[PDB]
Amino acid sequence: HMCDAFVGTWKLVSSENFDDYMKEVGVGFATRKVAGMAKPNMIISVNGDVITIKSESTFKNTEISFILGQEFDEVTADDRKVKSTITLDGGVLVHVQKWDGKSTTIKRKREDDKLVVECVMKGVTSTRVYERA
Ligand SMILES: CC(C)n1c(S)nnc1COc1ccccc1Cl
């Protein structure tokens, strides 16, 4: 019942500073422009210890499945090959991605009826708000 309040189908309803986040991550111009248009569906489910997070959009479709605390390989939507570890910290899903000596952290939390995604790369934060689909 760990992540019960995350489970469901969510749709992006607002984004702030995502272009600057993508720049900081190293995403090139054309991907930033096309990716920035996308309004993804995020679909979160849990089966036993395994959490699955799917992102479906006109840009790319991605899927990760993982066990909390256990590192895995992830190919991001912008085609980075990263090593990811996701933990729960005080009710927040904390997702760290490591690649090429770099690191970014994505936090997912429930706030009111929203699922709020905070993406941080060094000094730059983007906030992406999702509501139930
Ligand atoms: C998990 C989080 C960062 N996210 C949310 S929220 N919506 N899409 C993404 C994946 O990241 C993307 C997507 C496209 C291009 C570049 C990146 Cl870095």
From Swiss-Prot:
Residue list for modification Phosphoserine: 14
Record's GO cellular component terms: cytoplasm; cytosol; extracellular exosome; lipid droplet; nucleus
Annotated GO MF terms: fatty acid binding; hormone receptor binding; long-chain fatty acid binding; long-chain fatty acid transmembrane transporter activity
Binding site for a fatty acid: 128-130
One Pfam family matching this protein: Lipocalin
Stretches assigned to coiled coil: none
Positions where Phosphotyrosine occurs in the chain: 21
Keyword field: Acetylation, Cytoplasm, Lipid-binding, Nucleus, Phosphoprotein, Transport
Modified residues (N-acetylcysteine): 3
InterPro entries: Calycin, Fatty_acid-bd, ILBP, Lipocln_cytosolic_FA-bd_dom
Main location: cytoplasm
Record's subcellular location: Cytoplasm; Nucleus
Motif (Nuclear localization signal): 23-33
GO BP, one annotated term: fatty acid transport
Domain comment as written in the entry: Forms a beta-barrel structure that accommodates hydrophobic ligands in its interior.
UniProt record similarity statement: Belongs to the calycin superfamily. Fatty-acid binding protein (FABP) family.
Subunit and partners: Monomer. Homodimer. Interacts with PPARG.
Role noted for this protein: Lipid transport protein in adipocytes. Binds both long chain fatty acids and retinoic acid. Delivers long-chain fatty acids and retinoic acid to their cognate receptors in the nucleus.
Protein name (Swiss-Prot/TrEMBL): Fatty acid-binding protein, adipocyte
Origin species: Homo sapiens
Name of the gene this protein is made from: FABP4
